[PDB]
Amino acid sequence: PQADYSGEIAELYDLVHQGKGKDYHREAADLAALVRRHSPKAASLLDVACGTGMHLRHLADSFGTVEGLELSADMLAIARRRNPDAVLHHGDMRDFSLGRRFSAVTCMFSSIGHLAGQAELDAALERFAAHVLPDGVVVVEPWWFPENFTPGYVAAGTVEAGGTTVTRVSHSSREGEATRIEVHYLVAGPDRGITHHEESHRITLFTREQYERAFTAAGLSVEFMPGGPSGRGLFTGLPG
Amino acid sequence: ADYSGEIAELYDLVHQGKGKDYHREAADLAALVRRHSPKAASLLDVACGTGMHLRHLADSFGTVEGLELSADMLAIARRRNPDAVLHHGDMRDFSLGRRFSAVTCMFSSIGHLAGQAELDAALERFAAHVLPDGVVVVEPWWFPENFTPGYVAAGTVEAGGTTVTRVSHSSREGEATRIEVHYLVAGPDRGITHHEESHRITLFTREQYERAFTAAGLSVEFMPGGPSGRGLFTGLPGA
Ligand SMILES: Cc1cn([C@H]2C[C@H](O)[C@@H](COP(=O)(O)OP(=O)(O)O[C@H]3O[C@H](C)[C@@H](O)[C@H](N(C)C)[C@H]3O)O2)c(=O)[nH]c1=O
Ligand SMILES: Cc1cn([C@H]2C[C@H](O)[C@@H](COP(=O)(O)OP(=O)(O)O[C@H]3O[C@H](C)[C@@H](O)[C@H](N(C)C)[C@H]3O)O2)c(=O)[nH]c1=O
Ligand SMILES: Nc1ncnc2c1ncn2[C@@H]1O[C@H](CSCC[C@H](N)C(=O)O)[C@@H](O)[C@H]1O
Ligand SMILES: Nc1ncnc2c1ncn2[C@@H]1O[C@H](CSCC[C@H](N)C(=O)O)[C@@H](O)[C@H]1O
């Protein structure tokens, strides 16, 4: 049971989230508009935990420079193939140092939840502040806050494309300060038969004030906007 | 063991999810029986499984009994049909010491036999348990000409807090279908569990079924369509 977005799990990622109705084109359009509201001259964007680089692909149409940081080599390989021109980095949002600063540092789809507690979140936000330009914005899509988390939640969905049928079932429970989300897959095709895969993640249920404390310790002013890309809302931060 | 444990426990929910209507099939079956035997009063369901047909057939026939090889399936059937006599046994060699107006074998259970000889044997046993005015009914598996290798079935159903996803894959293995079936079973407390079964279901030709019926002294007819699109064979003694 893996926790590192690798192997076959990485290969299924885009198909499954497409099946669940995720619309990266609309999300990118909205994000780019939000960046330009806070920074009308923005010409550059770093997407941290870029995964398979789906947002970056669309954001390349709005900004002259897009870069990405991704911990998982297998996700990153997909991201690079999708963004063959972009400079994408293999590393860790807790401790990274790129060549430059950007008008927007973004961290989407609750990837920030993969951090383990307040020290790590603080560290990541300090790094984001370190890579943002003075008239820029830091954008973090949080995981659920403890008060909005729904333990016992089961998601199931099946999709097919290109001869491959993929079923994904998730189960979520409370494990201390985090969601434990277990995810099983059945992957079927006419000649390959059926294979079973599993993943299991601890995604931290930070409170709003814990997010805010992280932005604040980084020198960033912080604003929460409810709703956002997944019903989890959006944090925006501005330097100095 | 085939059809055992958690697989047996999931059987009814997954086939309900797939739209299988045992109430309508039982009514159609009862009508077919009574067309051939208007005073029909008894029925034996061979390979009765969880006893879903029998539950409904008991409202049409004064006596219903069943034969089932799997203990875990049989336990379910008994709980569903607590007034009925259900036997633990094998369609290839059983002997109940009585006869019935109908002997039925539904949902391609006959595919669990291998070879002409086992098929002949079963049909002889069915003839040995049918009344002389009655009828043997067997739902075949697919004929070779209609089998679709590489077939993938996937569906998800939820009942009572439990979400079950079933995915089957089918290929050719000699003169049979190899069907492998994976389940993901999920619930708020239970989490997710994975289960798997795998079966060989023999691709008997139409002529093979007819040979089995004729050797058991039954006059045979194939009725196309049937409960599953695979038709139904009927057989009447005294040929
Ligand atoms: C609607 C609603 C949902 N939830 C929770 C329950 C459950 O944990 C989740 C819905 O399950 P899903 O299987 O639909 O979760 P998902 O597609 O959002 O995947 C989640 O986990 C993946 C493993 C991660 O890769 C992913 N991010 C980090 C990329 C993460 O967002 O959202 C709540 O806690 N409160 C709610 O009001
Ligand atoms: C429509 C069509 C289907 N098929 C085949 C392909 C595949 O093997 C099957 C459809 O898949 P499914 O997973 O829908 O099969 P099913 O719910 O009917 O389960 C079958 O297998 C189960 C393991 C058995 O327990 C069961 N009987 C013996 C009780 C048997 O009927 O039917 C064909 O070969 N040709 C066809 O034209
Ligand atoms: N410490 C860390 N630094 C960088 N990336 C991380 C990380 N911990 C987890 N990740 C990455 O977080 C990503 C979560 S999946 C989200 C991917 C992408 N933002 C999207 O919207 O589709 C994964 O690719 C995972 O490898
Ligand atoms: N040799 C044999 N004798 C009796 N039952 C058998 C058999 N081989 C397989 N079976 C039974 O055949 C059944 C197939 S499942 C079909 C069950 C039922 N007739 C229904 O329509 O739902 C299983 O319960 C299996 O255990």
XYZ file of C-alpha atoms and ligand atoms in Angstrom:
605
model
C 0.000 0.000 0.000
C 1.777 3.153 -1.275
C 1.803 6.814 -0.132
C 4.046 8.316 -2.728
C 2.049 8.870 -5.953
C 4.080 6.355 -7.910
C 3.880 3.573 -10.430
C 0.481 2.685 -11.720
C -1.185 5.048 -9.247
C 0.610 7.938 -10.952
C -0.509 6.691 -14.412
C -4.194 6.559 -13.336
C -4.186 9.943 -11.609
C -5.373 12.135 -14.526
C -7.971 9.688 -15.807
C -9.554 9.259 -12.379
C -9.755 12.984 -11.581
C -11.135 13.679 -15.068
C -13.779 11.019 -14.355
C -14.598 12.788 -11.066
C -15.277 15.974 -13.072
C -12.191 18.005 -12.172
C -11.808 20.871 -14.636
C -8.271 22.174 -14.673
C -8.982 24.543 -17.573
C -11.629 26.442 -15.566
C -9.449 26.297 -12.450
C -6.456 27.780 -14.373
C -8.624 30.513 -15.909
C -9.891 31.445 -12.442
C -6.403 31.294 -10.870
C -4.779 33.418 -13.589
C -7.562 36.048 -13.197
C -6.978 36.041 -9.431
C -3.243 36.453 -9.797
C -3.668 39.386 -12.196
C -6.086 41.039 -9.753
C -3.317 41.203 -7.118
C -0.444 41.678 -9.550
C -1.466 43.156 -12.839
C 2.046 42.794 -14.269
C 2.555 39.175 -13.182
C 4.570 37.355 -15.831
C 5.681 34.331 -13.828
C 4.191 31.424 -11.771
C 5.523 28.533 -9.697
C 3.135 25.672 -9.035
C 4.320 23.732 -5.984
C 3.240 20.059 -5.785
C 2.382 20.321 -9.490
C 1.727 16.615 -9.810
C 1.056 15.783 -13.423
C 1.261 19.409 -14.405
C -2.348 19.819 -15.511
C -2.777 23.349 -14.120
C 0.683 24.343 -15.465
C -0.290 23.273 -18.997
C -3.128 25.768 -19.035
C -1.281 28.454 -17.048
C 1.478 28.491 -19.702
C -1.060 30.346 -21.898
C -1.430 33.214 -19.381
C 2.144 33.759 -18.068
C 5.504 33.870 -19.863
C 7.256 31.744 -17.303
C 5.779 28.724 -15.515
C 7.837 26.420 -13.289
C 6.803 23.503 -11.033
C 8.094 21.668 -7.990
C 7.067 18.027 -7.461
C 8.345 15.492 -4.877
C 7.294 12.363 -6.801
C 9.453 11.392 -9.780
C 6.664 9.469 -11.480
C 4.217 12.375 -11.254
C 6.982 14.706 -12.442
C 7.753 12.534 -15.451
C 4.160 12.912 -16.550
C 4.276 16.650 -15.833
C 7.410 17.110 -17.971
C 5.950 15.161 -20.915
C 2.891 17.370 -20.732
C 5.003 20.602 -20.384
C 8.115 19.687 -22.430
C 9.245 23.332 -22.598
C 8.811 24.229 -18.890
C 11.471 23.998 -16.209
C 10.137 21.567 -13.607
C 11.986 20.718 -10.431
C 12.201 17.518 -8.451
C 11.951 18.506 -4.826
C 10.239 19.204 -1.550
C 8.016 22.183 -0.694
C 9.407 22.182 2.851
C 12.934 23.002 1.714
C 13.649 24.134 -1.802
C 15.654 26.862 -3.473
C 15.093 27.676 -7.154
C 16.857 30.152 -9.440
C 14.335 32.993 -9.146
C 11.188 34.485 -7.601
C 7.710 34.496 -9.218
C 4.636 36.676 -9.303
C 2.529 33.789 -8.051
C 3.433 30.804 -5.894
C 0.509 28.360 -6.020
C -0.213 25.085 -4.174
C -3.419 23.445 -5.359
C -5.782 20.553 -4.665
C -5.008 20.352 -0.923
C -1.455 19.106 -1.540
C -0.482 21.269 1.501
C -2.241 18.614 3.603
C 0.637 16.255 2.904
C 2.633 18.223 5.501
C 2.772 16.608 8.938
C 2.156 19.452 11.395
C 2.696 23.145 12.178
C 6.485 23.210 11.798
C 6.284 21.763 8.262
C 3.453 24.051 7.195
C 5.333 27.053 8.560
C 8.494 25.915 6.727
C 6.645 25.493 3.428
C 4.989 28.898 3.722
C 8.391 30.519 4.454
C 9.668 28.910 1.274
C 6.691 30.180 -0.670
C 7.347 33.712 0.658
C 10.994 33.295 -0.309
C 9.986 32.609 -3.949
C 7.392 35.329 -4.301
C 8.051 38.781 -5.844
C 7.200 41.844 -3.759
C 4.066 42.657 -5.750
C 3.138 38.971 -6.032
C 0.620 36.621 -4.422
C 0.871 33.236 -2.650
C -2.135 30.965 -3.285
C -2.785 27.838 -1.182
C -5.827 25.539 -1.548
C -6.222 24.028 1.928
C -7.419 20.560 2.892
C -10.704 20.467 4.879
C -10.707 22.118 8.291
C -11.501 19.736 11.183
C -14.986 21.242 11.560
C -15.890 20.473 7.927
C -14.353 16.977 7.664
C -16.851 14.136 7.102
C -15.465 10.893 8.486
C -16.826 7.661 7.056
C -17.016 9.156 3.583
C -16.897 6.665 0.723
C -16.407 7.760 -2.885
C -16.739 5.308 -5.746
C -16.583 5.899 -9.458
C -15.742 4.107 -12.637
C -14.454 5.516 -15.913
C -13.205 4.093 -19.185
C -10.835 5.386 -21.861
C -8.824 3.767 -24.620
C -9.804 0.191 -23.726
C -9.038 0.594 -19.998
C -11.790 0.620 -17.309
C -10.709 2.095 -13.994
C -12.659 1.878 -10.747
C -11.622 4.012 -7.777
C -13.032 3.720 -4.279
C -11.935 5.899 -1.396
C -12.572 5.655 2.292
C -11.828 8.448 4.767
C -11.621 8.382 8.542
C -10.205 10.484 11.377
C -6.699 9.509 12.496
C -5.677 11.953 15.230
C -4.922 15.310 13.623
C -5.392 14.029 10.032
C -7.678 12.338 7.549
C -6.652 8.771 6.780
C -7.807 8.289 3.178
C -7.454 4.788 1.779
C -8.004 4.328 -1.960
C -8.379 1.099 -3.915
C -8.419 0.705 -7.683
C -9.451 -1.999 -10.093
C -8.010 -1.576 -13.553
C -9.439 -3.739 -16.261
C -8.822 -4.255 -19.955
C -9.589 -6.864 -22.569
C -6.116 -8.355 -22.742
C -4.551 -7.171 -19.458
C -7.326 -8.628 -17.288
C -7.881 -7.095 -13.856
C -5.289 -5.615 -11.500
C -5.809 -4.232 -8.013
C -3.930 -1.216 -6.609
C -3.993 0.608 -3.330
C -2.851 3.868 -1.809
C -3.132 5.320 1.676
C -2.561 8.933 2.761
C -2.508 10.959 5.972
C -3.742 14.437 5.037
C -3.533 16.884 7.967
C -6.662 18.628 9.219
C -5.102 22.006 9.864
C -7.406 24.631 11.314
C -7.908 27.936 9.552
C -5.894 29.710 12.255
C -3.052 27.221 11.739
C -2.963 28.134 8.015
C -3.122 31.818 8.983
C -0.362 31.456 11.523
C 1.829 29.888 8.813
C 1.243 32.761 6.355
C 1.781 35.277 9.172
C 5.071 33.809 10.387
C 6.220 34.023 6.706
C 5.657 37.774 6.471
C 2.536 37.282 4.387
C -0.801 38.931 4.999
C -3.524 36.314 4.620
C -7.160 36.201 3.403
C -9.501 33.175 3.275
C -12.077 32.938 0.472
C -14.773 30.258 0.946
C -15.971 27.974 -1.860
C -13.016 27.891 -4.243
C -11.976 25.037 -6.565
C -13.163 22.041 -4.439
C -15.528 23.537 -1.814
C -12.507 23.852 0.497
C -11.919 27.546 -0.263
C -8.660 29.372 -0.946
C -5.944 31.191 1.013
C -4.174 34.195 -0.668
C -1.111 35.854 0.858
C 0.697 39.112 0.012
C 4.282 39.914 1.074
C 5.560 42.564 3.509
C -14.079 -22.775 -2.057
C -16.169 -21.547 -4.920
C -19.222 -19.484 -4.032
C -18.141 -19.221 -0.393
C -17.366 -16.760 2.355
C -17.735 -13.085 1.590
C -18.336 -13.777 -2.106
C -21.457 -15.815 -1.221
C -22.560 -12.985 1.120
C -22.249 -10.430 -1.716
C -23.964 -12.550 -4.402
C -27.497 -11.313 -3.953
C -26.640 -7.628 -3.673
C -24.415 -7.627 -6.766
C -26.896 -9.471 -8.975
C -29.687 -7.137 -7.750
C -27.467 -4.194 -8.629
C -27.002 -5.663 -12.144
C -30.758 -5.631 -12.611
C -31.470 -9.351 -12.261
C -35.201 -9.714 -11.660
C -35.868 -13.026 -9.964
C -39.548 -12.202 -9.425
C -40.174 -11.905 -13.173
C -37.988 -14.834 -14.057
C -39.817 -17.064 -11.517
C -43.131 -15.986 -12.941
C -42.034 -16.743 -16.534
C -40.631 -20.073 -15.400
C -43.845 -21.001 -13.598
C -45.847 -20.181 -16.719
C -43.585 -22.228 -18.966
C -43.875 -25.166 -16.577
C -47.643 -24.961 -16.369
C -47.995 -24.747 -20.134
C -46.320 -28.158 -20.369
C -47.863 -29.559 -17.125
C -51.074 -27.815 -16.146
C -51.475 -29.704 -12.875
C -47.846 -29.045 -11.866
C -47.553 -28.896 -8.076
C -43.831 -29.374 -7.365
C -40.415 -28.098 -8.425
C -36.749 -28.895 -7.826
C -34.232 -26.089 -8.426
C -30.823 -27.607 -9.012
C -27.866 -25.331 -8.264
C -30.301 -23.166 -6.306
C -27.596 -20.879 -4.902
C -29.044 -18.413 -2.411
C -32.564 -19.634 -3.204
C -33.865 -16.454 -4.825
C -35.881 -18.273 -7.504
C -37.244 -20.725 -4.961
C -38.485 -17.869 -2.706
C -40.736 -16.681 -5.528
C -41.556 -20.084 -6.970
C -42.959 -21.202 -3.592
C -45.828 -18.789 -4.201
C -46.669 -20.689 -7.445
C -45.978 -24.342 -6.506
C -47.115 -26.292 -3.417
C -43.755 -27.984 -2.986
C -40.335 -26.499 -3.841
C -37.001 -28.113 -3.058
C -33.429 -27.271 -4.021
C -30.011 -28.854 -4.494
C -26.821 -26.835 -3.961
C -23.162 -27.912 -3.788
C -21.926 -24.883 -1.832
C -22.571 -24.927 1.879
C -22.235 -21.137 2.231
C -24.725 -20.555 -0.543
C -27.067 -23.180 0.836
C -27.019 -21.528 4.283
C -28.335 -18.359 2.671
C -30.983 -20.212 0.729
C -32.224 -21.980 3.887
C -32.538 -18.731 5.776
C -34.488 -17.306 2.870
C -36.622 -20.486 2.477
C -36.973 -21.790 6.014
C -40.039 -23.877 5.222
C -38.452 -25.664 2.235
C -36.372 -28.810 2.010
C -33.016 -27.896 0.498
C -30.350 -30.533 -0.086
C -26.582 -30.234 0.047
C -25.391 -32.125 -2.998
C -24.115 -32.386 -6.535
C -26.085 -32.179 -9.779
C -23.865 -34.857 -11.313
C -24.944 -37.571 -8.818
C -27.793 -36.980 -6.465
C -30.817 -39.053 -5.589
C -33.711 -37.599 -3.652
C -36.066 -40.601 -3.850
C -38.900 -38.519 -5.271
C -39.954 -36.739 -8.443
C -41.159 -33.236 -9.297
C -43.241 -31.606 -11.933
C -40.234 -29.438 -12.885
C -36.500 -29.767 -12.547
C -34.829 -26.433 -13.195
C -31.191 -25.276 -13.422
C -30.865 -21.555 -13.845
C -28.409 -18.780 -14.651
C -25.889 -20.992 -16.608
C -25.087 -23.044 -13.507
C -24.856 -25.996 -15.954
C -21.612 -24.360 -17.203
C -19.953 -25.537 -13.988
C -19.902 -29.031 -15.580
C -16.951 -30.073 -17.767
C -17.323 -32.410 -20.723
C -20.125 -34.164 -22.511
C -20.086 -37.014 -20.023
C -20.751 -34.818 -16.941
C -23.417 -32.945 -18.919
C -25.092 -36.246 -19.891
C -24.907 -37.386 -16.288
C -26.577 -34.307 -14.905
C -29.347 -34.452 -17.493
C -29.941 -38.116 -16.640
C -30.244 -37.145 -12.993
C -32.721 -34.438 -13.959
C -34.768 -36.975 -15.971
C -34.644 -39.266 -12.952
C -36.331 -36.599 -10.789
C -39.023 -35.399 -13.213
C -42.603 -36.617 -13.374
C -43.728 -38.179 -16.640
C -46.021 -35.254 -17.370
C -43.415 -32.664 -16.358
C -40.505 -30.644 -17.689
C -36.766 -30.221 -17.282
C -35.535 -26.660 -17.809
C -31.871 -25.695 -18.211
C -30.532 -22.206 -18.781
C -27.312 -22.756 -20.886
C -24.160 -20.645 -20.762
C -23.336 -18.781 -23.990
C -22.684 -20.921 -27.107
C -19.138 -20.607 -28.498
C -20.401 -18.582 -31.477
C -21.761 -15.880 -29.152
C -18.931 -15.678 -26.592
C -17.069 -12.328 -26.481
C -13.526 -12.733 -25.215
C -12.121 -9.658 -23.410
C -15.554 -8.691 -22.051
C -15.359 -6.362 -19.039
C -18.388 -5.817 -16.750
C -18.203 -3.123 -14.081
C -20.872 -1.848 -11.771
C -21.307 -0.375 -8.337
C -24.349 -0.664 -6.069
C -25.061 0.705 -2.596
C -27.443 -0.768 -0.053
C -27.897 -0.037 3.600
C -24.560 1.688 4.063
C -22.495 -0.815 2.021
C -21.015 0.088 -1.374
C -19.987 -2.836 -3.563
C -18.089 -2.560 -6.801
C -17.847 -5.704 -8.950
C -15.603 -5.955 -12.041
C -15.469 -9.083 -14.214
C -13.066 -9.990 -17.019
C -13.661 -12.957 -19.420
C -11.251 -14.775 -21.764
C -11.121 -18.176 -23.542
C -9.414 -21.062 -21.611
C -9.692 -24.216 -23.776
C -13.401 -25.034 -24.259
C -14.525 -22.639 -21.516
C -14.834 -19.127 -20.427
C -12.389 -18.016 -17.792
C -14.190 -15.300 -15.797
C -12.244 -13.489 -13.067
C -14.219 -11.247 -10.763
C -12.903 -8.602 -8.395
C -14.862 -6.835 -5.680
C -14.263 -3.739 -3.654
C -16.534 -3.662 -0.642
C -16.720 -0.394 1.281
C -18.565 1.096 4.261
C -18.175 3.845 6.841
C -16.772 1.569 9.578
C -15.693 -1.399 7.539
C -13.312 0.597 5.351
C -12.513 -1.020 2.016
C -11.889 -4.729 1.472
C -10.845 -6.505 -1.744
C -12.202 -9.964 -2.765
C -11.700 -12.155 -5.832
C -13.231 -15.190 -7.434
C -12.447 -16.967 -10.667
C -14.440 -19.598 -12.585
C -14.361 -21.754 -15.717
C -17.742 -21.834 -17.384
C -17.867 -24.353 -20.187
C -18.839 -23.220 -23.674
C -21.013 -26.215 -24.563
C -22.445 -26.047 -28.066
C -26.165 -26.102 -28.657
C -25.762 -29.609 -30.114
C -24.038 -30.754 -26.942
C -26.958 -29.672 -24.793
C -29.371 -31.391 -27.205
C -27.338 -34.600 -27.055
C -27.455 -34.551 -23.254
C -31.208 -34.142 -23.204
C -31.822 -36.841 -25.849
C -29.604 -39.331 -24.056
C -31.654 -38.839 -20.878
C -34.778 -39.711 -22.899
C -36.027 -36.126 -22.993
C -37.431 -34.413 -26.086
C -35.598 -31.130 -26.348
C -36.448 -27.634 -27.484
C -34.373 -24.454 -27.414
C -36.273 -21.322 -26.516
C -34.217 -18.237 -27.483
C -33.821 -15.161 -25.260
C -34.636 -16.416 -21.762
C -33.614 -14.849 -18.496
C -30.107 -13.797 -19.572
C -30.142 -13.669 -23.390
C -28.725 -17.192 -23.476
C -32.151 -18.847 -24.009
C -33.526 -21.903 -22.201
C -33.635 -25.586 -23.054
C -36.725 -27.553 -22.159
C -37.125 -31.292 -22.052
C -40.142 -33.578 -21.796
C -39.963 -37.265 -20.896
C -41.227 -40.006 -23.154
C -39.214 -39.493 -26.361
C -17.752 16.936 0.416
C -16.809 16.721 1.566
C -15.750 15.836 1.410
N -14.916 15.674 2.437
C -13.767 14.767 2.299
C -14.012 13.280 2.478
C -12.878 12.698 1.637
O -11.661 12.651 2.380
C -12.738 13.674 0.481
C -13.541 13.202 -0.722
O -12.923 11.969 -1.184
P -12.343 11.866 -2.689
O -11.936 10.453 -2.937
O -13.318 12.422 -3.700
O -11.103 12.905 -2.544
P -10.299 13.767 -3.626
O -10.539 13.338 -5.022
O -10.450 15.164 -3.121
O -8.769 13.258 -3.211
C -8.256 13.602 -1.964
O -7.380 12.494 -1.580
C -6.485 12.181 -2.602
C -5.865 10.926 -1.998
C -5.453 13.318 -2.765
O -4.557 12.984 -3.831
C -6.222 14.616 -3.087
N -5.370 15.830 -3.243
C -4.396 15.982 -2.153
C -4.730 15.847 -4.569
C -7.322 14.835 -2.061
O -8.054 16.028 -2.411
O -13.258 14.907 0.968
C -15.086 16.320 3.591
O -14.213 16.120 4.600
N -16.061 17.230 3.776
C -16.931 17.395 2.765
O -17.922 18.301 2.943
C -23.606 -9.931 -23.613
C -22.646 -11.082 -23.719
C -21.991 -11.489 -22.566
N -21.117 -12.470 -22.756
C -20.363 -12.980 -21.597
C -19.102 -12.248 -21.214
C -19.058 -12.573 -19.740
O -18.381 -13.827 -19.496
C -20.503 -12.666 -19.279
C -21.010 -11.341 -18.765
O -20.327 -10.980 -17.569
P -20.978 -10.769 -16.153
O -19.964 -10.381 -15.138
O -22.212 -9.848 -16.340
O -21.704 -12.188 -15.913
P -22.897 -12.737 -15.038
O -23.272 -11.736 -14.019
O -23.899 -13.395 -15.942
O -22.073 -13.932 -14.159
C -21.616 -15.024 -14.898
O -20.341 -15.345 -14.228
C -20.625 -15.542 -12.884
C -19.174 -15.770 -12.368
C -21.464 -16.806 -12.570
O -21.706 -17.032 -11.187
C -22.797 -16.681 -13.339
N -23.716 -17.839 -13.267
C -22.983 -19.065 -13.690
C -24.306 -17.995 -11.927
C -22.538 -16.243 -14.792
O -23.827 -15.957 -15.415
O -21.230 -12.945 -20.483
C -20.897 -13.079 -23.928
O -20.010 -14.090 -24.100
N -21.499 -12.730 -25.086
C -22.418 -11.743 -24.915
O -23.035 -11.445 -26.079
N 6.658 17.760 0.517
C 6.223 17.837 -0.774
N 6.761 18.645 -1.723
C 6.356 18.693 -3.007
N 5.312 17.942 -3.406
C 4.633 17.115 -2.582
C 5.060 16.993 -1.171
N 4.236 16.088 -0.604
C 3.373 15.635 -1.558
N 3.612 16.257 -2.714
C 2.890 16.097 -3.989
O 1.567 16.628 -3.772
C 0.826 16.205 -4.934
C -0.631 15.973 -4.518
S -1.722 15.566 -5.856
C -2.073 17.221 -6.484
C -1.351 17.489 -7.789
C -1.710 18.785 -8.535
N -1.527 20.007 -7.728
C -3.152 18.739 -8.993
O -3.918 19.679 -8.704
O -3.546 17.805 -9.695
C 1.494 14.906 -5.407
O 2.001 14.985 -6.721
C 2.597 14.662 -4.391
O 3.709 13.946 -4.925
N -22.000 -29.801 -9.521
C -22.867 -28.915 -8.925
N -23.985 -29.268 -8.256
C -24.798 -28.430 -7.609
N -24.504 -27.115 -7.608
C -23.457 -26.597 -8.270
C -22.543 -27.471 -9.031
N -21.563 -26.701 -9.563
C -21.852 -25.424 -9.175
N -22.958 -25.362 -8.431
C -23.643 -24.169 -7.906
O -24.079 -23.438 -9.078
C -24.403 -22.148 -8.537
C -24.127 -21.047 -9.568
S -24.696 -19.440 -9.080
C -26.379 -19.492 -9.752
C -27.311 -19.651 -8.587
C -28.838 -19.617 -8.864
N -29.296 -20.719 -9.696
C -29.221 -18.254 -9.358
O -29.867 -18.184 -10.397
O -28.897 -17.242 -8.752
C -23.638 -21.934 -7.235
O -24.412 -21.844 -6.057
C -22.718 -23.159 -7.266
O -22.258 -23.465 -5.957
